Design an enzyme around this catalytic site. Structure first.
Site, PDB file in Angstrom:
ATOM      1  N   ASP A  13      -2.412  -2.529  10.555  1.00 42.16           N
ATOM      2  CA  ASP A  13      -1.120  -3.071  10.145  1.00 42.16           C
ATOM      3  C   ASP A  13       0.091  -2.523  10.884  1.00 42.16           C
ATOM      4  OD1 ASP A  13       1.036  -4.310   8.928  1.00 42.16           O
ATOM      5  OD2 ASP A  13       0.053  -4.364   6.966  1.00 42.16           O
ATOM      6  N   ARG A  48      -3.243   1.542   1.954  1.00 39.18           N
ATOM      7  CA  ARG A  48      -3.432   0.092   2.032  1.00 39.18           C
ATOM      8  C   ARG A  48      -3.484  -0.412   3.479  1.00 39.18           C
ATOM      9  NH1 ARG A  48       1.712   0.712   0.578  1.00 39.18           N
ATOM     10  NH2 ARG A  48       3.257   0.260   2.197  1.00 39.18           N
ATOM     11  N   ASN A  49      -2.957   0.375   4.423  1.00 42.58           N
ATOM     12  CA  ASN A  49      -2.946   0.015   5.832  1.00 42.58           C
ATOM     13  C   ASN A  49      -3.988   0.767   6.668  1.00 42.58           C
ATOM     14  OD1 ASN A  49      -0.971  -1.921   5.423  1.00 42.58           O
ATOM     15  ND2 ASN A  49       0.718  -0.484   5.874  1.00 42.58           N
ATOM     16  N   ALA A  88      -6.236 -12.592   2.561  1.00 40.11           N
ATOM     17  CA  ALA A  88      -5.111 -13.448   2.888  1.00 40.11           C
ATOM     18  C   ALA A  88      -3.958 -12.546   3.251  1.00 40.11           C
ATOM     19  CB  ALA A  88      -4.749 -14.329   1.698  1.00 40.11           C
ATOM     20  N   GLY A  89      -3.185 -12.947   4.255  1.00 42.39           N
ATOM     21  CA  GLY A  89      -2.037 -12.170   4.683  1.00 42.39           C
ATOM     22  C   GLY A  89      -0.758 -12.969   4.675  1.00 42.39           C
ATOM     23  N   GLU A  90       0.298 -12.341   5.178  1.00 43.93           N
ATOM     24  CA  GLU A  90       1.587 -13.004   5.372  1.00 43.93           C
ATOM     25  C   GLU A  90       1.452 -14.296   6.180  1.00 43.93           C
ATOM     26  OE1 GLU A  90       4.608 -10.623   7.464  1.00 43.93           O
ATOM     27  OE2 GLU A  90       5.782 -12.478   7.702  1.00 43.93           O
ATOM     28  N   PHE A  91       0.543 -14.299   7.159  1.00 42.60           N
ATOM     29  CA  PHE A  91       0.499 -15.347   8.185  1.00 42.60           C
ATOM     30  C   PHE A  91      -0.583 -16.402   7.992  1.00 42.60           C
ATOM     31  CE2 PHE A  91       2.432 -11.625  10.267  1.00 42.60           C
ATOM     32  CZ  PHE A  91       3.661 -12.185  10.570  1.00 42.60           C
ATOM     33  N   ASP A  95       4.734   2.494   8.501  1.00 41.87           N
ATOM     34  CA  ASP A  95       4.102   1.954   7.298  1.00 41.87           C
ATOM     35  C   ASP A  95       2.790   2.647   6.899  1.00 41.87           C
ATOM     36  OD1 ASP A  95       3.966   0.348   4.997  1.00 41.87           O
ATOM     37  OD2 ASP A  95       3.554  -1.501   6.131  1.00 41.87           O
ATOM     38  N   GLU A 103     -12.279  -5.739  15.191  1.00 47.11           N
ATOM     39  CA  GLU A 103     -13.549  -5.190  14.698  1.00 47.11           C
ATOM     40  C   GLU A 103     -13.648  -5.370  13.186  1.00 47.11           C
ATOM     41  OE1 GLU A 103     -14.064  -0.815  14.744  1.00 47.11           O
ATOM     42  OE2 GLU A 103     -11.929  -0.758  15.306  1.00 47.11           O
ATOM     43  N   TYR A 104     -14.854  -5.631  12.688  1.00 45.80           N
ATOM     44  CA  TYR A 104     -15.076  -5.812  11.250  1.00 45.80           C
ATOM     45  C   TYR A 104     -15.206  -4.459  10.564  1.00 45.80           C
ATOM     46  CZ  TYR A 104     -16.666  -7.881   6.868  1.00 45.80           C
ATOM     47  OH  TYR A 104     -16.731  -8.301   5.536  1.00 45.80           O
ATOM     48  N   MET A 105     -14.540  -4.336   9.424  1.00 42.13           N
ATOM     49  CA  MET A 105     -14.509  -3.105   8.634  1.00 42.13           C
ATOM     50  C   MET A 105     -15.041  -3.468   7.256  1.00 42.13           C
ATOM     51  SD  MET A 105     -13.278  -0.915  10.818  1.00 42.13           S
ATOM     52  CE  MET A 105     -12.583   0.477   9.937  1.00 42.13           C
ATOM     53  N   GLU A 106     -16.320  -3.185   7.044  1.00 42.38           N
ATOM     54  CA  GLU A 106     -17.089  -3.741   5.935  1.00 42.38           C
ATOM     55  C   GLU A 106     -16.477  -3.424   4.553  1.00 42.38           C
ATOM     56  OE1 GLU A 106     -18.236  -2.197   8.855  1.00 42.38           O
ATOM     57  OE2 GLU A 106     -20.022  -3.323   9.502  1.00 42.38           O
TER      58      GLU A 106
HETATM   59  N1  LIG Z   1     -10.787  -5.827  10.163  1.00 43.04           N
HETATM   60  C1  LIG Z   1     -11.111  -6.175   8.909  1.00 43.04           C
HETATM   61  N2  LIG Z   1     -12.365  -6.097   8.441  1.00 43.04           N
HETATM   62  C2  LIG Z   1     -12.681  -6.451   7.194  1.00 43.04           C
HETATM   63  N3  LIG Z   1     -11.769  -6.889   6.329  1.00 43.04           N
HETATM   64  C3  LIG Z   1     -10.499  -6.989   6.745  1.00 43.04           C
HETATM   65  C4  LIG Z   1     -10.133  -6.643   8.039  1.00 43.04           C
HETATM   66  N4  LIG Z   1      -8.826  -6.853   8.160  1.00 43.04           N
HETATM   67  C5  LIG Z   1      -8.382  -7.292   6.978  1.00 43.04           C
HETATM   68  N5  LIG Z   1      -9.408  -7.397   6.131  1.00 43.04           N
HETATM   69  C6  LIG Z   1      -9.420  -7.843   4.720  1.00 43.04           C
HETATM   70  O1  LIG Z   1      -8.279  -8.705   4.556  1.00 43.04           O
HETATM   71  C7  LIG Z   1      -7.529  -8.179   3.462  1.00 43.04           C
HETATM   72  C8  LIG Z   1      -6.120  -8.628   3.764  1.00 43.04           C
HETATM   73  O2  LIG Z   1      -5.788  -8.390   5.133  1.00 43.04           O
HETATM   74  P1  LIG Z   1      -4.593  -7.380   5.554  1.00 43.04           P
HETATM   75  O3  LIG Z   1      -4.763  -6.789   6.896  1.00 43.04           O
HETATM   76  O4  LIG Z   1      -4.552  -6.264   4.399  1.00 43.04           O
HETATM   77  O5  LIG Z   1      -3.217  -8.274   5.468  1.00 43.04           O
HETATM   78  P2  LIG Z   1      -2.123  -8.253   4.276  1.00 43.04           P
HETATM   79  O6  LIG Z   1      -0.942  -9.052   4.691  1.00 43.04           O
HETATM   80  O7  LIG Z   1      -1.654  -6.738   4.078  1.00 43.04           O
HETATM   81  N6  LIG Z   1      -2.809  -8.880   2.908  1.00 43.04           N
HETATM   82  P3  LIG Z   1      -2.887  -7.945   1.573  1.00 43.04           P
HETATM   83  O8  LIG Z   1      -3.439  -6.586   1.745  1.00 43.04           O
HETATM   84  O9  LIG Z   1      -3.811  -8.724   0.522  1.00 43.04           O
HETATM   85  O10 LIG Z   1      -1.419  -7.972   0.896  1.00 43.04           O
HETATM   86  C9  LIG Z   1      -7.776  -6.663   3.521  1.00 43.04           C
HETATM   87  O11 LIG Z   1      -7.586  -6.098   2.235  1.00 43.04           O
HETATM   88  C10 LIG Z   1      -9.247  -6.621   3.801  1.00 43.04           C
HETATM   89  O12 LIG Z   1      -9.983  -6.802   2.557  1.00 43.04           O
HETATM   90 MG   LIG Z   2      -2.930  -5.569   3.309  1.00 40.88          MG
END
Ligand SMILES: Nc1ncnc2c1ncn2[C@@H]1O[C@H](COP(=O)(O)OP(=O)(O)NP(=O)(O)O)[C@@H](O)[C@H]1O
Ligand SMILES: [Mg+2]
Lengths: 9, 288
Positions: free
Chosen positions: B159, B145-146, B24-27, B141, B95-98
């Protein structure tokens, strides 16, 4: 980890 | 929006299948799924959706981050497959990042990788940043985490929420930010190199938080006074020295990303060099 982003006071 | 379509393909939603929520993200939410390409090849993707009832600002920020990402085509920067804007929910497909976010991945595997594996991760991050910086952007940033990491442990810069073009034209990630960027918003590729030094420490520490839970005000004061994060347990001397170099007070004395890539390439090429490892201190942070 809640204050990862913050302003400067 | 037109802004994003300069650098993002509009995808047909019939070619996208959603498997499950992974974040889950900001959006809105983040899902794994599949994308069928024009050639009929099917690939794993991440799908980010803009939440129902979004504001126009949220939409601009959401798509704006995709518009930046789409400018980069590099193996160590997250690949934008495209967007869906002509139907709703609005989507960004990458792209998926497992193995997900690098910091959380390393925390699951404390002390379980070889130094060469960790150096491989770090080299990828540096290579992505070299390209990003070549392209005239400051990320602003750069943090573990990014960085996302895939099934083969390849690390890729993600990010772009704070990223901007370096030109004469909000909250900051204080623990990751250079002292000059904190002091007066002096953001340059050298401030990204500072952040890279922090990521280097995060990786060698298996996802420990920079400066642990020190208050942001003390992080700012200590770093300005010349204190630095101490060597991670069993950290090769070469890699701690690289941290110190990334953390030079004078930004002009920091290595360029190209130099960082070269340094890591040598360590990969001569793995015995990593065997020299980095004691009694009067404080937790090290002065110098
Ligand atoms: N390309 C990707 N492939 C697989 N998992 C992803 C991918 N992008 C995001 N995720 C998963 O989604 C989570 C949250 O997405 P993210 O890009 O980190 O947004 P965020 O706003 O920073 N949310 P968060 O890290 O929980 O505060 C990540 O920790 C991954 O586990
Ligand atoms: Mg994140």
């Amino acid at each position: 980890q809640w204050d990862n982003y913050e302003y400067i006071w | 929006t037109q802004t994003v379509h300069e650098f993002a393909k509009e995808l047909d939603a019939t070619n996208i299948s959603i498997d499950k929520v992974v974040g889950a993200g900001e959006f809105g939410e983040v899902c794994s799924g599949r994308l069928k390409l024009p050639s009929k090849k099917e690939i794993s993707v991440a799908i980010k959706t803009l939440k129902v009832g979004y504001t126009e600002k949220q939409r601009r920020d959401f798509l704006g981050e995709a518009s930046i990402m789409g400018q980069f085509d590099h193996p160590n920067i997250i690949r934008l497959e495209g967007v869906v804007t002509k139907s709703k929910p609005v989507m960004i497909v990458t792209e998926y990042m497992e193995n997900g976010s690098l910091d959380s991945f390393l925390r699951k595997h404390d002390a379980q990788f070889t130094v060469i594996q960790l150096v491989g991760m770090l080299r990828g991050i540096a290579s992505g940043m070299k390209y990003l910086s070549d392209m005239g952007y400051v990320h602003r940033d750069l943090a573990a985490r990014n960085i996302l990491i895939n099934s083969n442990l390849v690390c890729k810069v993600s990010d772009f929420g704070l990223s901007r073009v370096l030109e004469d034209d909000g909250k900051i990630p204080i623990r990751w930010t250079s002292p000059e960027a904190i002091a007066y918003r002096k953001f340059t590729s050298a401030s990204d190199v500072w952040s890279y030094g922090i990521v280097l420490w995060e990786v060698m520490s298996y996802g420990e938080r920079p400066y642990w839970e020190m208050s942001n005000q003390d992080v700012i004061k200590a770093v300005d006074e010349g204190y630095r994060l101490p060597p991670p347990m069993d950290c090769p001397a070469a890699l701690y020295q690289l941290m110190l170099d990334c953390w030079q007070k004078d930004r002009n004395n920091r290595p360029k990303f190209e130099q960082i890539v070269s340094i890591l390439d040598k360590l990969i090429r001569n793995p015995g060099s990593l065997k020299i490892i980095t004691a009694a201190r009067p404080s937790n942070l090290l002065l110098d």
